[PDB]
Design a protein around this nucleic acid. Structure first.
Ligand code: HPA
Ligand code: HPA
Lengths: 338, 338
DNA sequence: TACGCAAGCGCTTGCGT
DNA sequence: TACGCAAGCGCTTGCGT
């Protein structure tokens, strides 16, 4: 079809080409002619042809996990802005933590020859680490590890451990000593590491968490529901709960309310994520803020670099969590004695 | 690179090709040879080359609005499943209700030669309807209109008006006569139409809604916050509120709580959407359920059809809302008198 | 000066043998 | 029988004039 433009304008296609991409000087007339032709013909230059020729698709892949989740959703939306802004195209792919699905999306991706690859898999068993190596050739950044688990990718690191510690401290310093925790999947950073951060804070305080006070969640409101229930559903119960993520949190609020418990009056709750509508939780959720966007943009950026400046060496940038005081926490019995 | 495989296997590329796509019979040996070559060479056939040749990208575009929003997010996630399932690739593009952005994404999309186009723009001013026509050649379905506003696209229709009516009725039948409403943007279906559905129900009941009782929202929790406040922040206030979408709803719950108001005890609330975690609202939100997934799959499906069976004629499928009884509504003063 | 030639990018597929 | 030839898909770009 570029032939078709060239001839309407009676110029070579080389010409048409150049004008379209201001790639060498063209006579005004000539230029106009082409534009006109382009217009009447209603010409959409083909990207695929172009890709075939220039060797890059100007599009990037996001091998995700799930996208509905607030947390995720929020990240992703960020990414897209960045893509758009630098003219990249976004291929969103959710593997649902499934190998097959993941091998599958991964192949489609290489085949479609994505310029780079954003990876948010949540859990990385060897089998998955393996597959990923098989594609080291295609540039990529993992956005969800706590530390660099490979030398063949960039990594943006969140400091989940230090956010967890921040969480516990706060409780401690607000008068708390009988706390419980609903962590996310241990096979994840946002799971394991947050918990650990939290645990250290406790040990330093000589606080011991009774196993009946620790209930695993899967980041879903239902899981928060069950844990909260199980925790309060017992003889002796904590006076404060540390909840792995804001959504499960939201789930935990629900159940407390259902047992007619008062937050923060009967139980204090501290979350983790600072999702877009945590403030609109009831009560307004006090939580730990994860810098989602910076998380997004920052990843994009490494990729671009690697992509453009043809970097070869793995890199890793850390980002920082921070406490957001809302209204789900109250003073504990030990506050005055400090 | 397919040349490279062909020669390692000492066969023509035509061969290599055929075996790769089981497109004509190949000798086992031959077949194996190729596979081997494919393997050592670590061969990823190129999709772009293939696309160039076969004339279809096997990938689809989603010109969206925003993706963080629960409502949206939920739809989209559905779409992706469908894409994956039939081997399509998903290009997610959010125009943020901005023309430029929209013209922009739209062009990138045609250029990248997407097989079909899923459109969720929210608001469709003529200027936008126009641009869309300019691409009638590329098959597409609008998933967010109340009625068919064009003859050059498929449409999946939601019955927002009948869901709105369902909303009002319920209130009416639960003893209510003093109601307020926080609708979404009138420039939208989910905005205008829901409201109207709701309004009809009232008129039939000889219920009049005092303008100070109607506050516009923008589907965001903050907007729900302000409206609820404004509504209760007045001399005379309703005993029940109809809220345009579950999120603004969640915002309205917050403010009631903040004014120390009791839901449903002091004010009843009925929402609209039945978002994934509405049940986890506090209280568990009573709302109108929109069949998001069917909404998703159903759209995909029309597209495919048009794409494969080369349909030409516009089509339109309706889908149906439905009431979900949770715990944010209470009997009104008139219940016993019916 | 301002522009055209023709080869290449990596596949697919209708004729043949 | 089981396979190869060569033209085409729609752009880009190094040499020339
Ligand atoms: O894996 C996760 N899923 C959902 N929300 C989350 N917030 C932190 N990590 C996660
Ligand atoms: O436009 C919308 N935005 C967000 N949520 C919604 N729920 C219905 N319509 C909408």
């Amino acid at each position: 079809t570029i032939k078709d433009v060239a001839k309407r304008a009676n110029v070579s296609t080389t010409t048409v080409s150049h004008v379209i991409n201001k790639t060498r000087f063209v006579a005004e007339e000539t230029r106009n002619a082409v534009w006109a032709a382009i217009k009447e013909l209603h010409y959409s230059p083909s990207a695929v042809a172009r890709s075939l020729a220039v060797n890059h698709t100007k599009s990037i892949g996001l091998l995700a996990t799930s996208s509905e989740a607030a947390y995720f959703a929020e990240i992703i939306e960020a990414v897209e802005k960045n893509c758009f802004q630098k003219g990249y195209t976004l291929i969103l792919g959710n593997a649902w933590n499934n190998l097959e699905k993941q091998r599958a999306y991964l192949s489609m991706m290489a085949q479609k020859r994505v310029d780079g690859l954003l990876v948010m898999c949540s859990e990385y068993p060897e089998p998955l680490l393996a597959m990923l190596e098989e594609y080291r050739h295609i540039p990529m950044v993992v956005m969800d590890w706590g530390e660099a688990k490979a030398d063949f990718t960039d990594a943006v690191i969140d400091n989940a451990f230090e956010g967890g510690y921040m969480a516990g401290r706060y409780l401690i310093e607000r008068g708390h000593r009988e706390i419980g925790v609903i962590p996310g999947p241990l096979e994840r950073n946002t799971g394991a590491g947050r918990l650990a951060g939290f645990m250290k804070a406790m040990e330093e305080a000589m606080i011991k968490v009774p196993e009946s006070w620790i209930v695993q969640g899967d980041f879903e409101p239902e899981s928060g529901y069950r844990a909260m229930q199980q925790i309060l559903s017992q003889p002796h119960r904590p006076t404060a709960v540390f909840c792995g993520g804001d959504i499960m949190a939201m789930g935990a609020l629900c159940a407390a309310d259902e047992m007619g418990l008062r937050v923060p009056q009967d139980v204090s709750l501290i979350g983790y994520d600072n999702v877009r509508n945590a403030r609109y939780f009831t009560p307004a959720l006090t939580t730990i803020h994860q810098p989602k966007d910076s998380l997004g943009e920052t990843a994009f950026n490494m990729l671009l670099d690697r992509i453009v400046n043809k970097r070869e060496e793995p890199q890793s940038i850390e980002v920082h969590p921070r406490l957001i005081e809302r209204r789900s926490v109250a003073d504990g019995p030990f506050r005055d004695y400090r």
